[PDB]
């Protein structure tokens, strides 16, 4: 809205109350969406005519964007530095009344329907030296992932392999330029944090993401990876504001399958400091999710 000139402010995303608020409040919300097309097919008996008909009736439910708006008498400071790291002073700053359009999506391991990084791949951590702190990866190119209710998700293996390389490299760039980067399945735990767990409005997918995190990098099958899924409903995870409970759309109703724009890795510490580093799919902590999108905002008083 109004770009501050020459002015620099201090950001600290790991101490940002937007994240906490946005996380306590905020539900998903779906609206009906019509995506009409036309089919015009030839009519041959002498191919004189042609019958144009409209026919993409299917009504689907689509996620509604939520914006966090600065309260009365306050504003939001926005970093425009395309490769900002969260903490520190931004030399290029804007002032907006509202954050961008966030489509809340509960999930672990993979960040869905999110904001791609503008320049190159970005990795972030509240503290890289603390192996417990979750690492947030933000691709600059989204990887399409097709999930059917039948119980499986598809991912172009070529696209994934390449996405891994980019991640591995930006990690090799954070933990010693000549380190071997290893991706391994989750070390174990509750289903939500061991599988690629995510919502499709009401229904929850648990996906065997073991094939996504099973490779070694810089160590001198099919054309499409298919993930096994279980699909369970979770009413207790439904939106509950006061007395009202909000029942999300029914099934074939909402379109499962989205775009991967981020990951949630966790680093293996201890006796892992020498020949190589090991990263496993993490998350299960939704605050990390919200930070993935709110790193570049901070709320202040309008002086």
């Amino acid at each position, epitope marked *: 809205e109004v770009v501050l000139v020459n002015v620099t402010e201090n950001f600290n995303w790991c101490k940002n109350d937007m994240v906490e608020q946005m996380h306590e409040d905020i539900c998903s919300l779906w609206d009906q969406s019509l995506k009409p097309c036309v089919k015009l097919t030839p009519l041959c008996v002498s191919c004189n005519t042609s019958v144009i008909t409209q026919a993409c009736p299917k009504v689907s439910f689509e996620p509604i964007p939520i914006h966090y708006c600065a309260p009365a008498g306050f504003a939001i400071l926005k970093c425009n530095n395309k490769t900002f790291n969260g903490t520190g002073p931004c030399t290029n700053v804007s002032t907006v009344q509202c954050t961008h359009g966030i489509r809340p999506v509960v999930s672990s391991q993979l960040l869905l329907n999110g904001s791609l990084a503008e320049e190159e791949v970005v990795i972030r951590s509240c503290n890289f030296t603390d192996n417990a702190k979750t690492i947030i990866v933000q691709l600059n190119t989204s990887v399409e992932i097709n999930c059917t209710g039948a119980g499986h998700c598809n991912i172009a293996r070529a696209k994934w392999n390449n996405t891994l390389k980019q991640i591995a490299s930006k990690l090799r760039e954070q933990f010693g330029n000549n380190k071997t980067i290893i991706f391994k399945q*989750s*070390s*174990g*735990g*509750d*289903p*939500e*944090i*061991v*599988t690629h767990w995510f919502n499709c409005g009401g229904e929850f997918f*648990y996906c*065997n993401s*073991t094939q996504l995190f099973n490779s070694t990098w810089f160590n001198s099958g099919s054309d499409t990876i298919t993930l096994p899924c*279980r699909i*369970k409903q979770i009413i*207790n995870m439904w939106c509950k504001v006061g007395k009202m409970m909000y029942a999300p759309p029914i099934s074939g109703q909402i379109r499962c399958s989205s775009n991967i724009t981020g990951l949630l890795l966790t680093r293996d510490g201890g006796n892992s400091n020498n020949e190589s580093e090991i990263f496993r799919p993490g998350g*299960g*902590d939704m605050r990390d999710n919200w930070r993935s999108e709110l790193y570049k905002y901070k709320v202040v008083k309008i002086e």
Partner: antibody
Amino acid sequence: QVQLVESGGGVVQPGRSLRLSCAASGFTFRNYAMHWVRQAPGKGLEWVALIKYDGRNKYYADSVKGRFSISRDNSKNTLYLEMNSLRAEDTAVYYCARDIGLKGEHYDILTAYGPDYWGQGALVTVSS
Amino acid sequence: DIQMTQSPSSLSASVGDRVTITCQASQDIRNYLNWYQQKPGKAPKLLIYDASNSETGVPSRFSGSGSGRDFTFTISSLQPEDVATYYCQQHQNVPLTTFGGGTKVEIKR
């Protein structure tokens, strides 16, 4: 070095309350569901309470519903179980156990998968 | 809320023999059943998980089988230190339940 050490055993008179702890170590605590199981002296094993990883969903036996409270601080890797209105029948050994993860068992999605590692127990006697 | 039955309650058996314990659930629980072994005094141990899976480290002679409402824990060759009480647990549902007191195997020598 998967270890679960119970602490807070001792005596407590009928009607009072007690809170036991479980210092977990050697495994990402904030990722596993935790179990409380008790065993009357000389008798069988009785499952008491469960709590999922994030600490939200808790599950109790009918033999305690409304008297016991399971909780956890994933920041101190400790599991807690506070017990109110202790009777003479609550006099038992109290184990904490780690729920098996979601082993690649081909699997379906269940509430719990069962304990694998148990603690060495903590003796609680309800006596005046 | 599922009732679990074990048989026998207790049994004497010479070392080297093959001991068979049966588990029987009130209702279909697929293969969601674990077998636990509690030596005297010590704390319980997981031997078999999900009907027929051996934990890692668990001796080579312990096995499980079954599905539905009928299961079967089995020591191929009893050893002197296998003397303990054995419980079976179901996790098709909460609360979790076993046969209270399980099966006490003791050696005949």
